[PDB]
Paper text:
We determined the crystal structure of apo-[name] to 1.87 Å resolution using the molecular replacement method, which exhibits a symmetric dimer conformation. Each [name] monomer possesses 16 α-helixes (α1-α16) and 9 β-strands (β1−β9), forming two distinct sub-domains: an N-terminal dimerization domain and a C-terminal canonic α/β Rossmann fold catalytic domain. The swapped dimer conformation is mediated by the N-terminal dimerization domain of each [name] monomer, which interlocks with each other and forms an extensive dimer interface, covering a total surface area of 3947 Å2. Structural comparison analyses of [name] with LaPhzM and MmcR revealed an extra protruding N-terminal α−helix in [name] that can further stabilize the interlocked dimer structure. However, PdxI possesses one more N-terminal α−helix comparing to [name] for the formation of the swapped dimer. Notably, although the overall structure of the catalytic domain of [name] shows high similarity to the SAM-dependent OMT LaPhzM and MmcR, there is no incorporation of SAM in the determined [name] structure, in agreement with the previous finding that purified [name] is free of SAM or SAH. Further structural comparison identified a unique solvent-exposed and negative charge enriched pocket between the dimerization domain and the catalytic domain in [name], which corresponds to the SAM/SAH binding pocket in MmcR28. Sequence alignment and structural comparison of the SAM/SAH binding pocket revealed that the critical glycine-rich GxGxG motif and F241 residue for SAH binding in MmcR/SAH complex are replaced by CxGxG and L252 residue in [name]. Apparently, the bulky side chain of Cys introduces steric hindrance for SAM/SAH binding and the replacement of F241 by L252 also eliminates the putative π-π stacking interaction between SAM/SAH and the aromatic side chain of F241, leading to the reduced binding ability of [name] for SAM/SAH. Given the uniqueness of the solvent-exposed pocket in [name], we propose that this pocket might be the substrate-binding pocket to generate 9. Intriguingly, the loss of SAM binding is critical for [name], providing an additional binding site for gluN2H3.
Author numbering:
A (entry chain B), B (entry chain A): 3 to 361
Write the structure that this text describes.
Amino acid sequence: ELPPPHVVREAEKARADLQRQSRELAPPPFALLELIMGVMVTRAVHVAAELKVAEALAEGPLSADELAGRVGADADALGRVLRLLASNGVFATRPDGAFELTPMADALRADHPMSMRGIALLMGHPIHWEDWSGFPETVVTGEPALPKLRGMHAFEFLTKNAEYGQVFFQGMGSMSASETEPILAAYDFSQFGTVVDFCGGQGALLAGILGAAPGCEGVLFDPRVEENGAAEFLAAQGVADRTKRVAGDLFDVPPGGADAYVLKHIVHDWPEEQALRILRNVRAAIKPGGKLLIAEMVIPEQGDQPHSGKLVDLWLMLLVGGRERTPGQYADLLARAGFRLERVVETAAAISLVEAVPV
Amino acid sequence: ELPPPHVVREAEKARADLQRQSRELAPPPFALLELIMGVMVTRAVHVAAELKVAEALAEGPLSADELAGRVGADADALGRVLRLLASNGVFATRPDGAFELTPMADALRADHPMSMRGIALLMGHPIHWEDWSGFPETVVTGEPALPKLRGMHAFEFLTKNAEYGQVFFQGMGSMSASETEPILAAYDFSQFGTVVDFCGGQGALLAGILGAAPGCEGVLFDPRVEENGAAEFLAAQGVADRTKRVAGDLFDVPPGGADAYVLKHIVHDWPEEQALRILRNVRAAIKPGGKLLIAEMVIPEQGDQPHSGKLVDLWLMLLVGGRERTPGQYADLLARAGFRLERVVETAAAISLVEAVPV
């Protein structure tokens, strides 16, 4: 069972206070140096993921020599990487010299229900690693780095380079998979008779909604919906007889008259002009009584508390020219597309639901 | 002044306990994800350093809009970067949306006496960025990446590419500047009549030693001592009348019979065979009664407590095939070179002094 959202907000505030306390116990230049060197920790996590160290330790603790033999690495180098990771909570060292899992290292297993292996691999992938070298020019110019580095848009590059496209998609999945259940626990989808999951890919969220709302019928609206794997996935979830697959373009007007249009991680992909184009298309389809639900990490309007959206924001800026928004920015954007923001519904995770009605 | 080191050891333990409590409040996959994304915080600090935002805010708080023309960056992009940094204690957001300095952001100023600007710039430099792409194979093979990626030892690349050599030197200087005073407060250099700073660079440490020991004469032994600015620096420090500059190779026998040989961040750069060669050469120079002082981050023999040496170890592995060592590893290395470990002298910083006597 998932904790109520207010319990998670309290844990976030407590964590932020512990982190502020910690930083203040250090010389400021030393606390800054720790942040500067964080790229090295990323690299250490990445190699542990690439070598499937967590899978190798799932059957019990292994010495450096035994582990290195099973994963095909150097025992000395691997033990030194694991010593560093263990000092950050990822794996543990024993007095007898063997290494073993911790809860954080367990989430590097591919088969963990909330696996971070995908994003660990993506953050160290040579293509994405090079993307980050464009970050200073992105801040200078405001323009994403990917079109300058690759001669094309992010989406065109991912479809043309299918192998890295899967790396990228699995990296996005590590983050997205934690979002369905918090959304379902925070919002009553049984109020809806029909829902359109707008560019919902394989339909993970739509299947969640339909499983939670037995009287609801779903439209999975996605350009790839016939190649997606969606048909196999929706049937395995037992909702296929309540779903219509509609192949349509990202910039098409979706089927009209649905009780809810659900847009998860769509709006934040795009520069404002294209984001507005998409929302106006949804505005043309929606009827009075219908709701628009935008599922995104909403950045609080004020304050310096940590938020996942503040970090994901930079990633959007680098790659696609999108951004994360505050509630006030969502209100302004929605008002320019013929919508009124009604509420921002928080969840037990970082994502929220921006609820809007047509006006 | 600096505190006696037990206040520092207690703050280190408190910080470690606070970080562990913070990890325990988070879902393990999300705490892991924060570590995975460290590369993004490195890039955010790097662009703030490159743009000299800290200097721009010296006269008082400024909005991102006010900063755009001051530093030559996009107002929107810069504001989103600073918002992320401020959530990590680097700069802060005022209620009116303007950004202001914090003590950690103060340390990004180029002229800060403990400036971290040099290392922030090195960590994001494209050459260093590319070098880190060789880390997975360093762990697979145990071998440093530089010969494989660039066809030469890291230090030979530094010598042949003068511009990157200065970026690297400034980045090393950021971390080194924090080490001189802790070393002087921990160890009585007034007991020595003569001190050799072995491969001491420009002489920063040796100047500190001579200032702490007004009756001491120094030898600055370094291959580049006639080209690296040592004469100008020593004269500016007022110690040039008590310093002999000696040009020599890293693998030469240094001037003989000195009361103390000081090796700071020399031994950890080298595979064991080369490290022993250097230590045996010092052994051939030192005479009975002399002391060998090795200034390095010393990794504790057991436990998973955070220690700066555990992270720097991976940098050494990647770039030069060196390593950080525990006390017992230093004791074994010293014994094979004709020394005996006498004390490991802690300081108010991460670095320690390994004191050894010739046997």
